[PDB]
Design a protein around this ligand. Structure first.
Ligand SMILES: Cc1cc2nc3c(=O)[nH]c(=O)nc-3n(C[C@H](O)[C@H](O)[C@H](O)COP(=O)(O)OP(=O)(O)OC[C@H]3O[C@@H](n4cnc5c(N)ncnc54)[C@H](O)[C@@H]3O)c2cc1C
Ligand SMILES: Cc1cc2nc3c(=O)[nH]c(=O)nc-3n(C[C@H](O)[C@H](O)[C@H](O)COP(=O)(O)OP(=O)(O)OC[C@H]3O[C@@H](n4cnc5c(N)ncnc54)[C@H](O)[C@@H]3O)c2cc1C
Lengths: 458, 458
């Protein structure tokens, strides 16, 4: 229940659409990618411009409404919808302006990654981002953003040159390396904690065809494959990216039918560079076990981005446990394989990513992103359909994480689950957390923006 | 030179971005995909809403400025930029709202196809459109729209249920099967003649992974290959799509070095349905010649959409000559193969497409789109870099068209080049042209919207 004159001012300033609990499209509009999050906002505000976002931020502040901000809706913690507050929904703000000559993209805060990649790839350009096309640019970038171009070109934030952001007081600011640089440091890794980013500006790279391979190894050869991977990646050129996704084999025709539904290692790899050299490089890492269901192709970068994940199934419910590693020992490898063998849903993956490369050459305190120096990421990404099965899949992720606890440190804020609100200090570390609290105290002293991996002020 | 009060009235209502000739980004903003078209507008109005388009249309009408309308800028005739007028530039109106439950997408008139496919594929949904992701949804749909899903699900227009359209008098209309149906018939194939479409609504289809192959055949085997293709497609199920792209072989590692840069047939095919049936279906048509550089993949639809074309290179300059055929005779085939052997540029293709299927089952009078009953499309699509070579690549497409033209009928308005303004009556046929002229008399009597394949009123 809201103050009528304040609501009137808000509606008058707001050119976008307002979705109320009684409108037919409220239920669909309040659903986010993590279907285990069922929440009922008081109001959904579909913003169409920066002044729309200003109006919405101001209205939430005057009304005392809990603020959720939504880009693409992919929050693994469920942060983009609230019970009883306002959803500042940016999904209609999807435009990208690309300069081919200047190698620049200016993208609104509601963009979906596939819209961005399409727009830059019209000119054979790109900048690093995540591997699934319908992820939102917004939350991803603000937490760091990594994927197929990161070992070559860094995190998304390593290519961000400025933002336009609406702060909790209703003001609009530009943050860059030369203008409000403390805020610029903080948004590069600090999440939505300091305001609503309504435009991101990135430097772009020329990225022609990329030689790519995806294949599946039997878990019988699991030890030799994973050891080959971790050995190789410690000295591999930045141009090679090679990731392992332990999962049940999808029922696709390139795979023998007797392997369908059984745990396997799906290995995906690419070479950012000359495709003839890439072919040589990928053949050099494809044979540590027998590759089943091998697909090799020379792909436009936009098609590489659109390819993940084999099977093309969107799961309804998810639960993720994740952390970094500094090393992947033989015993950690057996633990990984032991829990991979117990995967139950065909949409679960136990992901082993190797970052390093350009990501680790950025000095640690240049941004708010922690753990550049830990090259391994393990993500126990449980995903399933049946709501009566939540406990069994959640358990797989939780137990696997616990079993590897001796090897795991830190944690990517963008892979954190709904129950992980207190992993924040550990993820960032004490020095970064303290600096972030100081920027929080300057720019969001009332913690208006607290549906995120939250950094309280002071 | 503009009346101040008229300009002030525009600025009072307009909330978008203006680009003037002295502005930094003028030169990139006025460039369109057909780089041979070098024109200099008085003003680029980058609209961000339906009221922006209303103000821009009324401003152009009141000011006497010639109106260009831009969606993705892919006009093969160069229609989306004008000398001395206003470009009503829709590229920032890129938002797509998808309802998974309703299997509906509402897309703004400025969307790029890859933005649209990213948004629908977030819900494993799709609807037919062209094969290159950076194509604009607006000009494509308005001329009809065909691609990988068309044999199965029709043209884009066969999945179109309504539009929001700003007409030349500045009013906003809805056209659907229930509201202004006369206009609705016309916008489904009649281009931007009737007003600026600010929103399209589409029915969507559930489209999971699709089995896909691309391979290259030597021109030595051209005759048996093309004859096998035309014979197979005559009775093929709707679920198989199979296209031939004659071109120079790209210098990719999957192809033998001795074929790089030589004329070949690039055959691409896919099955829209079960991927195991798809594998059986494609294996059966892959071997009409010896398949070199063979890539087979089981792809998310969004990645099939991002795949075209092998080499992933964007030409600066293009020149197109196209038509339909009712049958592809042996004599036509020989001519095709003879002119393909003369291809000079690595970006040129001679395209041989087979539509039919669900496109041909829509009654001919049901939309403004002509030649549903001709299943063959040939497109001599010259593309290149160096402006000093225009004559040699233009001559190639002209002479191939002339040597085939007796077998050709009609022409897709979206493949017309800048010198084909005179092909309009013939492309549409007498009946459709006459009905379109009456809709023109009703909705754009002053031909404000004449930078398109134009239908003058009455
Ligand atoms: C299928 C899938 C694949 C993924 N793949 C990758 C990957 O390859 N690499 C990677 O690094 N991450 C990846 N992620 C994680 C992703 O980075 C996070 O889920 C991220 O938060 C997604 O942002 P979003 O805008 O879609 O989500 P949302 O749910 O909308 O928002 C996430 C958070 O950011 C805030 N927020 C969002 N937009 C804005 C904005 N414009 N301004 C201010 N705050 C904002 C929200 O308030 C919230 O705290 C993936 C996630 C999914 C579900
Ligand atoms: C590389 C490439 C690949 C292609 N592939 C295919 C394909 O596979 N299938 C296919 O069917 N076509 C294909 N096309 C052709 C495409 O359909 C036409 O070029 C179409 O006109 C492109 O639309 P656009 O919005 O990008 O172009 P623009 O240059 O922006 O516009 C084209 C015309 O439409 C008008 N217009 C654009 N948007 C609107 C709007 N919202 N309301 C009113 N008028 C509007 C413009 O005024 C102009 O007359 C391809 C084109 C290219 C260059």
């Amino acid at each position: 229940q809201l103050d009528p004159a304040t609501l009137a001012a808000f509606s008058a300033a707001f050119r976008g659409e307002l979705i109320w609990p009684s409108d037919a499209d409220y239920d669909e509009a309040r659903r986010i990618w993590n279907g285990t999050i069922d929440r009922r906002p008081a109001l959904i505000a579909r913003c169409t411009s920066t002044p729309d976002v200003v109006a919405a931020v101001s209205f939430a502040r005057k009304s005392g409404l809990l603020v959720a901000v939504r880009g693409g809706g992919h929050s693994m913690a469920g942060h983009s919808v609230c019970d009883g507050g306002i959803v500042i929904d940016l999904s209609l703000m999807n435009s990208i302006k690309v300069s081919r000559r200047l190698r620049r993209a200016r993208a609104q805060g509601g963009c979906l990654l596939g819209a961005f990649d399409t727009a830059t790839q019209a000119h054979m350009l790109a900048t690093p981002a995540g591997v699934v096309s319908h992820t939102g640019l917004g939350g991803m970038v603000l937490g760091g953003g990594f994927g197929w171009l990161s070992r070559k070109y860094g995190l998304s934030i390593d290519n961000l040159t400025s933002v336009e952001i609406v702060t909790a007081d209703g003001g609009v600011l530009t943050a860059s390396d030369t203008e409000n640089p403390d805020l610029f440091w903080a948004v590069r890794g600090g999440g939505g904690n300091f305001g609503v980013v309504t435009a991101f500006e990135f430097d772009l790279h020329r990225v022609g065809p990329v030689r790519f391979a995806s294949t599946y190894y039997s878990l019988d050869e699991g030890p030799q494959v994973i050891r080959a991977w971790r050995d190789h990646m410690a000295t591999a050129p930045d141009e090679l990216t090679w990731a392992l996704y332990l999962r049940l084999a999808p029922p696709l025709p390139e795979l023998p039918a007797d392997m369908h539904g059984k745990p396997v290692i799906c290995a995906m790899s690419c070479w950012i560079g000359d495709p003839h050299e890439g072919e040589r490089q990928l053949e050099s890492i494809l044979h540590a076990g027998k590759p089943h269901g091998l697909t090799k192709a020379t792909l436009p970068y936009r098609a590489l981005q659109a390819y993940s994940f084999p099977g093309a199934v969107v799961p309804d419910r998810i639960y993720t446990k994740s952390g970094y590693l500094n090393e992947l020992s033989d015993e950690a490898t057996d633990t990984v394989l032991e829990h991979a063998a117990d995967i139950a849903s065909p949409f679960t993956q136990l992901e082993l990513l190797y970052l390093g490369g350009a990501v680790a050459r950025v000095p640690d305190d240049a941004t708010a992103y922690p753990n550049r120096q830990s090259p391994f990421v393990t993500n126990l990404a449980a995903a399933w359909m049946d709501p009566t099965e939540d406990a069994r899949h959640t358990a797989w992720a939780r137990e696997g994480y616990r079993a590897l606890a001796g090897h795991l440190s830190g944690g990517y804020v963008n892979f954190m689950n709904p129950g992980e609100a207190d992993r924040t200090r550990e993820a960032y570390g004490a020095a970064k957390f303290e600096r972030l609290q100081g920027v929080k105290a300057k720019y969001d002293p009332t913690n208006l923006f607290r549906l995120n991996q939250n950094i309280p002020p002071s």
